[PDB]
Design an enzyme around this catalytic site. Structure first.
Site, short mmCIF file in Angstrom:
data_model
loop_
_atom_site.label_atom_id
_atom_site.label_comp_id
_atom_site.label_asym_id
_atom_site.label_seq_id
_atom_site.Cartn_x
_atom_site.Cartn_y
_atom_site.Cartn_z
N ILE A 15 0.83 -1.21 0.00
CA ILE A 15 0.00 0.00 0.00
C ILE A 15 0.86 1.26 0.00
CG2 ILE A 15 -1.77 1.28 1.38
CD1 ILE A 15 -2.89 -1.42 -0.23
N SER A 17 5.03 2.88 1.54
CA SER A 17 6.38 2.66 2.04
C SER A 17 7.13 3.96 2.28
CB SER A 17 7.16 1.79 1.04
OG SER A 17 8.51 1.62 1.44
N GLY A 18 8.05 3.85 3.19
CA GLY A 18 8.95 4.89 3.53
C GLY A 18 10.20 4.23 4.00
N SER A 19 11.09 5.04 4.52
CA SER A 19 12.21 4.53 5.22
C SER A 19 11.63 3.81 6.43
CB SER A 19 13.14 5.65 5.63
OG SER A 19 14.37 5.11 6.04
N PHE A 20 12.35 2.85 6.97
CA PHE A 20 11.92 2.23 8.21
C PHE A 20 10.73 1.28 8.07
CE2 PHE A 20 13.11 6.72 9.02
CZ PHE A 20 14.38 6.49 9.50
N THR A 22 7.06 -0.38 5.90
CA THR A 22 6.19 -0.65 4.75
C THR A 22 4.87 -1.26 5.16
OG1 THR A 22 8.22 -1.31 3.63
CG2 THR A 22 6.21 -1.55 2.42
N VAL A 23 3.80 -0.72 4.64
CA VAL A 23 2.47 -1.22 4.95
C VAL A 23 1.92 -2.08 3.79
CG1 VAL A 23 0.09 -0.58 5.70
CG2 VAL A 23 2.07 0.63 6.64
N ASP A 123 0.60 13.93 16.38
CA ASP A 123 0.54 14.27 14.98
C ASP A 123 -0.87 14.29 14.44
OD1 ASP A 123 1.56 15.07 12.49
OD2 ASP A 123 2.34 13.19 11.99
#
Ligand SMILES: Cc1ccc(NC(=O)c2cccc(C(C)(C)C#N)c2)cc1Nc1ccc2ncn(C)c(=O)c2c1
Ligand SMILES: Cc1ccc(NC(=O)c2cccc(C(C)(C)C#N)c2)cc1Nc1ccc2ncn(C)c(=O)c2c1
Lengths: 257, 269
Positions: A15, A17-20, A22-23, A123
């Site tokens: 779905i 992703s980023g650093s660190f 992932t979904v 946040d």
């Protein structure tokens, strides 16, 4: 316990992703969302599982479990539809005042529950308010990651100043909620007229900038405009608490229907 | 943890009442349902909190907390709308086949989760499947009755009248005084599937409850599967028949039940 054994979860479509992290969308006794973490992110994983396992509320993303093998994973319910930000600002889904207030009420419920459990969201923003099946609010922290460009609009004056190197509190969360209320009642983002981000960061921090409350729609109730202004005050100790916010919203919701 | 301090919950309107337990609509960080128990029901309260705190699933009633002062209270989410029984039988809420299958799919998800957590429901019926906001299935146990033999090892159908239609042949026989299992829950699910696909309750033409109890127990009675609607998928009718088998060891498990329904749902779109 909440530990899910290896081979139970069927990890499907990626779905985001980023650093660190992932979904993924997956299968485990129905539809689920799986967030995979790097082995380095062990402490962060433990802190996120610790906070999530303290929550049992309709308006908070449902934590379901975690896995430690083969990788660190956080399993939650699968949310259907899109975020409140997407509805108001990306799409043009024109909600009736009844629905706007209901979203605000459902968000106050979620926020009030968190604060009672001594949890600061840190946040809060329309991108973190999921509209599950276009009706039920599910508050989560959907982010994956100057770098805080997608959160500055909801940042309290003292958060922008990073005032004690610890500027986060129940009051900074109340401020972000005032911005969500602004979005709901105007249909727009604050400072839409201002082009530079550094201008926003400087002017909000100094006290030289605050949202234009004349932009609220004509059918915005008087009580809502007052409460929004109370939530957005510069001095955090002047801001209301969520028990008061929620009672004001709930009393308003019944006065409308 | 989950203990709610005194004076936090605002107990409102009385929804239902029964022996031992009374339910209310209340306020605690939004809408909630509160179930007040008698001080004599302490063990039952502890067992119910113990089972509920093991569940975190979209299709299972959301447990939120409990209180022990001034009275024993179980706090859950507030469900909006009515039960599946009410929609199918008390009203005439006529669902499209897509929605019928979805309700079955959401119920198999909830049941599959329970079994994975080693929880036998013990009383699954359309009256215990809530249709939250007319769309999401919330499986719970909404019974307030407590009727049975407290001291009766072998015991009574004169107080179990609202559950007999969903009772497996071996449950009615109370054979070994240990008749409840994952398989007896599968049987009740076959009856819920019957209700969804026919739109009716099984044995609607039979007038005597004692006739149902005797004939189902003996093996002399089973639901009329010719009553299913014409658009009932072939796979659904076969699965329903597999769920309703007399020998419990012939009945399928929920991982398989779920897999058959999920593939069927996507096969319909
Ligand atoms: C899979 C996952 C696991 C954990 C978290 N964590 C949190 O949201 C969270 C993390 C820390 C703290 C909090 C608090 C308690 C502050 C809140 N709220 C929440 C998010 C997710 N993301 C997630 C969850 C469900 C989803 N359904 C649909 N769609 C389309 C998605 O993109 C999706 C993403
Ligand atoms: C207030 C309460 C507390 C606990 C339980 N307990 C159970 O549902 C339960 C008790 C034991 C075991 C199980 C299991 C886990 C097996 C299931 N499912 C569930 C029910 C309720 N009843 C309850 C809960 C929410 C409600 N919302 C709307 N309406 C209109 C109601 O009548 C109502 C009733």
């Amino acid at each position: 316990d909440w530990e899910i054994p290896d081979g139970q979860i069927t990890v499907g479509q990626r779905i985001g992703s980023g650093s660190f992290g992932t979904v993924y969308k997956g299968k485990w006794h129905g539809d689920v969302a799986v967030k995979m973490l790097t082995p380095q992110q062990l402490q962060a994983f433990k802190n996120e599982v610790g906070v999530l396992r303290k929550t049992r509320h309709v308006n908070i993303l449902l934590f379901m479990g975690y896995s430690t093998k083969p990788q660190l994973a956080i399993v939650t319910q699968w949310c259907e539809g899109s975020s409140l930000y997407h509805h108001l600002h990306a799409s043009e889904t024109k909600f009736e005042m009844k629905k706007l207030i209901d979203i605000a009420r459902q968000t106050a419920r979620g926020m009030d529950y968190l604060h009672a459990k001594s949890i600061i969201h840190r946040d809060l923003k329309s991108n973190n308010i999921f509209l599950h099946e276009d009706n039920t609010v599910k508050i989560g922290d959907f982010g994956l990651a100057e770098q805080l460009s997608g959160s500055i609009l909801w940042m309290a004056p003292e958060v922008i100043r990073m005032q004690d190197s610890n500027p986060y509190s129940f009051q900074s969360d109340v401020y972000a909620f005032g911005i969500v209320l602004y979005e709901l009642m105007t249909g727009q983002l604050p400072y839409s007229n201002i082009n530079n981000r550094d201008q926003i960061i400087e002017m909000v921090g100094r006290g030289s900038l605050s949202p234009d409350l004349s932009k609220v729609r004509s059918n915005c109730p008087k009580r809502m405009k007052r409460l929004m202004a109370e939530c957005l005050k510069k001095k955090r100790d002047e801001r209301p608490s969520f028990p008061r916010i929620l009672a004001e919203i709930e009393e308003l919701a019944r006065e409308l229907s």
